[PDB]
């Protein structure tokens, strides 16, 4: 899985983009947060990720969802 | 996801989220999927669980279930 250090680091990055502190970020920020952590998903990969995480159409990504996407992205690096 | 599918998924999720906190546990994912007429293998379930439960809390909420169903359909 992910370590407790990886989770802490991902949470710090995530926190930088949740500027209202409500626990979510917009899907429009996913690429930016991933790039801040050194990942460089293509626009196609990013759009696929967004369609999936945003299946409910609320346009929100929360921290467990971000970890899931990082975890999925790290199985494919 | 069609509106029908989303509706079917929400009905299924609700079958298990009887306390209404919008959350079920990872232990229940297999049974939820069976309620939809699917018979995922233990290996498939472990794969889904390891991903959605990256944070180690053992919890699945409804948006996550939808995402998992969407990802399983690809
Ligand atoms: Mg926010
Ligand atoms: Mg959301
Ligand atoms: Mg519940
Ligand atoms: Mg959870
Ligand atoms: Mg959530």
Curated annotation (Swiss-Prot), chain A:
Q: How is it modified after translation?
A: Ubiquitination results in a strongly decreased activity. Phosphorylation results in a decreased activity.
Keywords of this entry: Acetylation, Calcium, Cell projection, Cilium, Cytoplasm, Cytoskeleton, Disease variant, Flagellum, Host-virus interaction, Isopeptide bond, Long QT syndrome, Metal-binding, Methylation, Phosphoprotein, Repeat, Ubl conjugation
The record makes one more remark, namely: This protein has four functional calcium-binding sites.
Q: What is this protein called?
A: Calmodulin-1
- For the cross-link Glycyl lysine isopeptide (Lys-Gly) (interchain with G-Cter in SUMO2), the position is 19
Using the record's annotations, give every residue carrying the modification Phosphothreonine: 42
Crosslinked positions (Glycyl lysine isopeptide (Lys-Gly) (interchain with G-Cter in ubiquitin)): 19
Subunit note: Homotetramer. Interacts with MYO1C, MYO5A and RRAD. Interacts with MYO10. Interacts with CEP97, CCP110, TTN/titin and SRY. Interacts with USP6; the interaction is calcium dependent. Interacts with CDK5RAP2. Interacts with SCN5A. Interacts with RYR1. Interacts with FCHO1. Interacts with MIP in a 1:2 stoichiometry; the interaction with the cytoplasmic domains from two MIP subunits promotes MIP water channel closure. Interacts with ORAI1; this may play a role in the regulation of ORAI1-mediated calcium transport. Interacts with IQCF1. Interacts with SYT7. (Microbial infection) Interacts with Rubella virus protease/methyltransferase p150.
Tell me the organism. Answer: Homo sapiens (Human)
The record comments on the domains as follows: The N-terminal and C-terminal lobes of CALM bind to the C-terminus of KCNQ1 in a clamp-like conformation. Binding of CALM C-terminus to KCNQ1 is calcium-independent but is essential for assembly of the structure. Binding of CALM N-terminus to KCNQ1 is calcium-dependent and regulates electrophysiological activity of the channel. The C-lobe interacts with KCNN4 channels in a calcium-independent manner, whereas the N-lobe interacts with the S4-S5 linker of KCNN4 in a calcium-dependent manner playing a role as calcium sensor and gating the channel.
Provide the gene name from the record: CALM1
Swiss-Prot record, chain B:
Q: Would you say which domain of life the source belongs to?
A: Eukaryota
**Residues that bear N6-acetyllysine:** 18
Question: Does the entry annotate any disulfide bonds, and if so which pairs?
Answer: none
Q: Which residues form the EF-hand domain?
A: 4-39, 40-74
Residues with the modification Phosphothreonine, per the entry, are: 41
Subcellular location(s): the record lists: Cytoplasm, Cytoskeleton, Spindle; Cytoplasm, Cytoskeleton, Spindle pole; Cytoplasm, Cytoskeleton, Microtubule organizing center, Centrosome; Cell projection, Cilium, Flagellum
Chain sites annotated for binding Ca(2+) 1: 17, 19, 21, 23, 28
| Linked residues for Glycyl lysine isopeptide (Lys-Gly) (interchain with G-Cter in SUMO2) | 18
Q: How is it modified after translation?
A: Ubiquitination results in a strongly decreased activity. Phosphorylation results in a decreased activity.
**Cross-link position, Glycyl lysine isopeptide (Lys-Gly) (interchain with G-Cter in ubiquitin)?**
18
Q: State where Ca(2+) 2 binds.
A: 53, 55, 57, 59, 64
Disease annotation reads: Ventricular tachycardia, catecholaminergic polymorphic, 4: An arrhythmogenic disorder characterized by stress-induced, bidirectional ventricular tachycardia that may degenerate into cardiac arrest and cause sudden death. Patients present with recurrent syncope, seizures, or sudden death after physical activity or emotional stress. CPVT4 inheritance is autosomal dominant. Long QT syndrome 14: A form of long QT syndrome, a heart disorder characterized by a prolonged QT interval on the ECG and polymorphic ventricular arrhythmias. They cause syncope and sudden death in response to exercise or emotional stress, and can present with a sentinel event of sudden cardiac death in infancy.
Q: What else is known?
A: This protein has four functional calcium-binding sites.
According to its UniProt entry, the function of this protein is described as:
Calmodulin acts as part of a calcium signal transduction pathway by mediating the control of a large number of enzymes, ion channels, aquaporins and other proteins through calcium-binding. Calcium-binding is required for the activation of calmodulin. Among the enzymes to be stimulated by the calmodulin-calcium complex are a number of protein kinases, such as myosin light-chain kinases and calmodulin-dependent protein kinase type II (CaMK2), and phosphatases.
> Which proteins does it associate with, and in what oligomeric form?
Homotetramer. Interacts with MYO1C, MYO5A and RRAD. Interacts with MYO10. Interacts with CEP97, CCP110, TTN/titin and SRY. Interacts with USP6; the interaction is calcium dependent. Interacts with CDK5RAP2. Interacts with SCN5A. Interacts with RYR1. Interacts with FCHO1. Interacts with MIP in a 1:2 stoichiometry; the interaction with the cytoplasmic domains from two MIP subunits promotes MIP water channel closure. Interacts with ORAI1; this may play a role in the regulation of ORAI1-mediated calcium transport. Interacts with IQCF1. Interacts with SYT7. (Microbial infection) Interacts with Rubella virus protease/methyltransferase p150.
Similarity section: Belongs to the calmodulin family.
- The name on file for this protein is Calmodulin-1
Q: What is the lineage of its organism?
A: Eukaryota, Metazoa, Chordata, Craniata, Vertebrata
Question: Coverage of the whole protein, first to last residue?
Answer: 5 to 78 of 149
């Amino acid at each position: 899985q992910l370590t407790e250090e990886q989770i802490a680091e991902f949470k710090e990055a995530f926190s930088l983009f949740d500027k209202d502190g409500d626990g979510t970020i917009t899907t429009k920020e996913l690429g930016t947060v991933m790039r801040s952590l050194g990942q460089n998903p293509t626009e196609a990969e990013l759009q696929d990720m967004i369609n999936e995480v945003d299946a409910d159409g609320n346009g929100t990504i929360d921290f467990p969802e971000f970890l899931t996407m990082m975890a999925r992205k790290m199985k494919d690096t």
